[PDB]
Write a protein that binds this DNA or RNA. Structure first.
Lengths: 124, 93, 110, 242, 123
RNA sequence: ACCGGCGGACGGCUCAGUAACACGUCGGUAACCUACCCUCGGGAGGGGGAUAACCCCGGGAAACUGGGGCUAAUCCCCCAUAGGCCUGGGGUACUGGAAGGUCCCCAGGCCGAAAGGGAGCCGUAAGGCCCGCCCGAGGAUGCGGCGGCGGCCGAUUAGGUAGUUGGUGGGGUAACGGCCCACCAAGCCGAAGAUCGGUACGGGCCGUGAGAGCGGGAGCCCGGAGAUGGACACUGAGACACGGGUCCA
C-alpha cells in the first residue's frame, strides 16, 4: 500500500513498535507522472468522502499567462528544466515549478497537474 | 370507597386522566370489574371508553393507589391505547 | 507591518519566505510561551528550552524541570543561542517543528 | 473497535441540561443534528413525555407527533428526535398553550409559559456575517438559521446583535444592538439565568473572547463571556424572563 | 453424449438434443460464438421445431456448462479449468453491489469433458 | 421475488499488543472531511438505452451455475445551462486580536445537476395541498491531524539514531508535515538517565489507614485496540468491515 503515516523512529532515535494496523483513511495513492503527448489523457478519481479529482497522465496543451493577466491556450513542446528532479526533465515529466518550452517560449508552471488536471504557467 | 386525588384533561389526546385512592380496610384488593363499574358512576362516563391501567396494592396499607383513563370515542382508544390493556379490561378478546 | 495579534513590535527585516508570520502565508493560533535558545545549528530551526518548578505531593518540595521545544527560526529575526525569545503554536511544519519564534525578547549579549 | 458514526446514546452519558432520570433505564434518544447544539437542546420527545406529561409511553408520544399537533416556531415537526433548543417557542394550538425554552439558574432547561402574542417573536443572536455570490449578505444565527439581505443593509447588522425574528413568516422586526447599557440575559456558565446591564466590554486578544461585565438589577457586578451574553432589550427585557 | 440446447430468437423456444459419435468430433476444437451449418450437424430441425427452415440455417455456439457445472466464459481462452475473480460476466451472479468472489470457470473453447452445449439458431 | 431507498462502519464481545501525543486536562485546525437533519438563494428541460421476475429447454452429488423471448422506475447513458476546480491581472466589502481568506470585474482552461411520486379534495385539466429530487452558502452530528503538562521498574542495560535531524523543490493525501521523492547541509537524543530489556491498555475510580500515604485498574461509564497469526483489495459519506471477499500459515 501507500501509507502516509508515523515514522518508525522517534526524534531521539528509539525505534517505535506499531500497535495497530494501517487505516484506509491514512493511505495515499500512486504518482501521476504527467507526460508530454499529442493528446490530453486524464483519469477521474473518487476520493475520501466521495469527492472527485482528475489527474493528467498525458498532457498536450497548456494555459500560459502574460504578466498583464491575459491567458493563451497553447501547445507544449518540451520541458526545459525540472528543479524537483533531474530524471524528470529527461523523461518529459510535467510538474509545478518546472521550466517549459512552448511555441511562445519559456514558461514556468504555476499549477500541479496531479491535482488540478490542467497545467497553467507564466510566460517568462 | 374511592376518593379522587386528581382529574386532568389531555386535550391533545381528548381524554381524562384520573388519579384516585381506594379504601379497602381488611378486605382483599378489589377486582377490576367492580372498581370500573363503581367509578363509572360519579363522573358520568361511558364504560367502553374508560380504561383502568393500574391499581397498586400497598404493603401494610389499607389504601391502594389507582390510575385510569377516560377517552371520548371508540376509535381513539383502539388507535392509541395498545391491545394488551384492552385485553386486561376485556375490551378486546 | 502586518498584525500578528501579539503585543510586540515587528521585525525590521522583510523576508520573502512563505513561513514568516510577519512575511508569509502561515498563521498563529494556540498558546504563546517564552524561553531561551539553546541550539541553532539546523537550518531555519530552533530548540527553545524552558525551566519550571514542579510540586511533589508526597514530599512538599519543588522539582525544577527543564523542557525543550523545537521551533522554526525565520531569517528575518535570526535567533541565536543565549537569547530570550517568544514562541507561538503554529501549523505543522516538519516532523517535529510545531512552534515558531515571534520575537527576540533579549539577545545574548545583553 | 468503533468504525465511524454512532447511532446510540446511553442514558448515563446524557447532557446535564436534561431533567431526565438516569438510572431508571439505559437507553435514551440520540438527537439528530439540527439547529441547536447537544449542550443547549433536548429531543422534543422528552418535552412531550416529561415536561408536559402528555405522553407516558414514547410510542404514544410519537403518535401524537405524527398527528402534527405541535407548532415549534410556527412549524409542525414530526421528528421525535428534533433538537428543540434555546429560546425556541413551543406552541400547542389545540390547547392554546405557549412556552419558551430557557435554562435554569442551575444549568437546566425549563418551559417558561409566555403570552400568545409573544409566541411569534424569536430573538436570534447574530453569530456571524458572510458575503455570498451576488454580493449578498448572509447572517448565521446562534440557532444555526440563516438570513439573506442586501449589501446596502449590511451595516444594519453586526455580529452579537439580536434580531427579533417573526418565525411564522420569517420577517425581521427589530435589531437590538450591542452597546453599553443594553439589557442582557445570560445563556450558559455559572451566571446562567441571570439578567442585567452591561458596563464594559473586555477586549481580550490571544484566543479568549470578549468578557462583558453585567450589572444586575440590584447593582451587583459580575462577568461572563461575549457569546454567553444574549441581549433582550435596550433597558428592559422585551420578553418575560424569570 | 453432448446435450445441445438449441434456442430460437424468432419463437423464444428452445429444445434439447443429444450428440454422440463423429458429430461430437465436429464440435471439438470450436469456440463460443463459432458458427456451423446445421447440415454438418445433421438434425431435422424442421421436424423438431415443426416449421420450415431455410437450408442455410446456421447454429452459433453460445454457452453451456461443464460436467461439474462450470460454464465456458467467452472472455477466457482455452478449454481448461482456471480460477478467476469475477466481479461480473457470465457464470457469476452478484447480490451486493461491489461484491467480488473468486470462482473456477471454464474457458471459452469447447472440450470433450463439457456435457452441456448451448446454441442459438440463425437464418 | 426483482434493480432500487436505507441499514448491516452503530450496537454486542474482549485486553493480546501497545511504554505510544494510545490516553486525562486544556488549546488545536486559517491545514480536513462529512450521507441521513436544520436554515437560506436558485434549479429540476430534452433525448436514448438496459435486464431482472415470468415462459422454453441445461449441468453437476453438491456448492453453485448456461442460453433464447420480451419487461421497470427517482436504474444507466448524451446534450442544454448553471455549477466544481486551477491560474494571471485588477480592485472593493464581510469575518477575525491576528494572518490571509472570502466579495466583485476581467482574462485562460478542464471537469461538469436533478425526479418525480401512491392516494385523496377542488379544478375538464394544468395547478395547489402531502411526500420526494438537485446546485450553492452556512449550521449541526461524527470523525481526521497538530501541541504544553500528567501519569512504571532495571545501570550486573551508557552511549544512541541514516530519511537520522534540518533546508530547497516537488509528489501523493480529505487535509499540514520526510508521509514519499531529488538535491543541499551535520544534525538531533543521552547522567533533570537516551538506548535496550522487564513489565503494562489510560481515566472516572476502588481496598486500607486517624490521616500523610500504600496498593490495585476484574465488575458500569468515557477514550484506545482487536476479530486464530499475517497480508491485500472492492462496495462505498463512513472499512480494510465478528455475522462481506482474496492468498499464505
Amino acid at each position: 500500500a501507500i501509507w502516509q503515516g508515523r515514522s518508525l523512529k522517534k526524534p531521539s532515535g528509539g525505534r517505535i513498535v506499531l500497535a495497530r494496523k494501517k487505516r484506509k483513511r491514512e493511505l495515499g495513492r500512486e504518482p501521476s507522472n504527467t507526460r508530454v503527448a499529442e493528446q490530453d489523457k486524464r483519469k477521474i478519481i473518487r476520493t475520501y468522502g466521495g469527492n472527485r479529482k482528475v489527474r493528467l497522465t498525458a498532457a498536450a496543451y497548456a494555459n500560459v499567462f502574460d504578466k498583464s493577466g491575459k491567458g493563451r491556450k497553447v501547445r507544449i513542446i518540451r520541458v526545459i528544466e525540472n528543479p524537483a528532479n533531474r530524471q524528470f526533465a529527461r523523461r518529459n515529466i510535467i510538474t509545478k515549478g518546472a521550466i517549459i518550452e512552448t511555441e511562445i517560449g519559456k514558461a514556468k508552471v504555476t499549477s500541479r497537474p496531479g491535482q488540478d488536471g490542467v497545467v497553467n504557467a507564466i510566460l517568462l | 370507597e374511592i376518593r379522587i386525588k386528581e382529574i386532568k384533561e389531555n386535550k391533545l389526546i381528548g381524554r381524562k386522566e384520573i388519579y384516585f385512592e381506594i379504601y379497602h380496610p381488611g378486605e382483599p384488593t378489589p377486582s377490576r370489574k367492580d372498581v370500573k363499574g363503581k367509578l363509572v358512576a360519579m363522573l358520568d362516563l361511558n364504560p367502553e371508553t374508560t380504561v383502568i391501567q393500574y391499581i397498586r396494592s400497598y404493603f401494610g396499607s389499607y389504601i391502594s393507589k389507582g390510575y385510569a383513563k377516560a377517552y371520548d370515542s371508540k376509535e381513539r382508544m383502539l388507535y392509541i391505547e395498545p391491545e394488551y390493556i384492552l385485553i386486561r379490561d376485556g375490551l378486546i378478546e | 507591518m502586518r498584525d500578528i495579534g501579539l503585543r510586540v513590535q515587528p521585525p525590521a527585516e522583510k523576508c520573502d519566505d512563505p513561513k514568516c508570520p510577519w512575511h508569509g502565508n502561515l498563521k498563529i493560533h494556540g498558546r504563546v510561551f517564552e524561553g531561551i535558545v539553546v541550539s541553532d545549528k539546523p537550518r531555519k530551526t530552533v530548540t527553545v528550552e524552558r525551566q519550571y518548578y514542579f510540586y511533589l505531593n508526597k514530599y512538599e518540595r519543588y522539582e525544577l524541570r527543564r523542557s525543550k521545544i523545537h521551533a522554526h527560526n525565520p531569517p528575518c529575526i535570526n535567533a541565536k543561542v543565549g537569547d530570550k525569545v517568544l514562541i507561538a503554536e503554529t501549523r505543522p511544519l516538519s516532523k517535529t517543528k510545531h512552534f515558531v519564534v515571534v520575537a527576540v525578547l533579549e539577545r545574548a549579549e545583553e | 473497535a468503533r468504525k465511524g458514526p454512532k447511532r446510540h446514546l446511553k442514558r448515563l452519558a446524557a447532557p446535564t441540561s436534561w431533567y431526565i432520570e438516569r438510572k431508571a433505564y439505559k437507553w435514551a434518544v440520540r438527537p439528530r443534528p439540527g439547529p441547536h447544539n447537544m449542550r443547549t437542546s433536548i429531543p422534543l420527545l422528552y418535552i412531550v413525555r416529561d415536561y408536559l406529561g402528555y405522553a407516558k409511553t414514547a410510542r404514544e408520544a410519537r403518535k401524537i407527533l405524527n398527528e402534527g399537533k405541535f407548532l415549534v416556531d410556527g412549524r409542525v415537526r414530526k421528528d421525535y428526535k428534533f433538537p428543540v433548543g434555546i429560546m425556541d417557542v413551543v406552541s400547542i394550538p389545540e390547547t392554546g398553550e405557549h412556552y419558551r425554552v430557557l435554562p435554569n439558574r442551575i444549568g437546566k432547561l425549563i418551559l417558561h409559559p409566555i403570552s400568545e402574542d409573544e409566541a411569534f417573536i424569536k430573538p436570534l443572536r447574530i453569530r456571524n456575517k458572510r458575503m455570498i455570490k451576488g454580493a449578498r449578505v448572509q447572517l448565521n444565527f446562534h440557532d444555526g438559521t440563516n438570513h439573506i439581505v442586501s449589501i446596502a443593509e449590511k451595516d444594519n447588522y453586526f455580529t452579537s446583535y439580536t434580531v427579533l425574528m417573526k418565525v411564522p413568516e420569517r420577517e425581521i422586526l427589530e435589531v437590538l444592538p450591542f452597546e453599553k447599557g443594553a439589557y442582557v440575559f445570560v445563556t450558559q456558565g455559572k451566571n446562567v439565568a441571570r439578567k442585567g446591564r452591561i458596563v464594559e466590554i473586555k477586549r481580550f486578544p490571544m484566543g479568549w473572547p470578549d468578557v462583558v461585565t453585567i450589572e444586575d438589577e440590584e447593582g451587583e457586578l459580575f462577568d461572563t463571556l461575549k457569546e454567553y451574553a444574549f441581549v433582550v432589550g435596550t433597558d428592559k427585557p422585551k420578553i418575560s424572563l424569570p | 453424449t453432448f446435450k445441445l440446447v438449441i434456442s430460437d430468437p424468432k419463437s423464444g423456444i428452445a429444445k434439447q438434443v443429444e450428440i454422440t459419435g463423429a458429430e461430437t468430433e465436429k464440435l471439438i476444437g470450436k469456440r463460443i460464438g463459432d458458427q456451423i451449418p446445421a447440415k454438418e450437424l445433421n438434425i431435422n430441425l424442421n421436424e423438431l421445431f415443426g416449421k420450415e427452415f431455410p437450408e442455410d440455417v446456421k447454429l452459433e455456439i453460445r454457452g453451456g456448462t461443464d460436467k461439474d457445472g462450470f460454464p465456458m466464459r467467452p472472455d477466457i481462452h482455452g478449454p481448461r479449468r482456471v480460477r478467476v475473480l469475477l466481479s461480473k460476466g457470465p457464470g457469476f451472479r452478484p447480490k451486493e453491489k461491489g461484491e467480488r468472489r473468486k470462482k473456477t470457470v471454464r474457458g471459452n473453447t469447447i472440450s470433450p469433458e463439457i456435457v452441456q452445449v448451448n446454441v442459438k439458431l440463425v437464418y
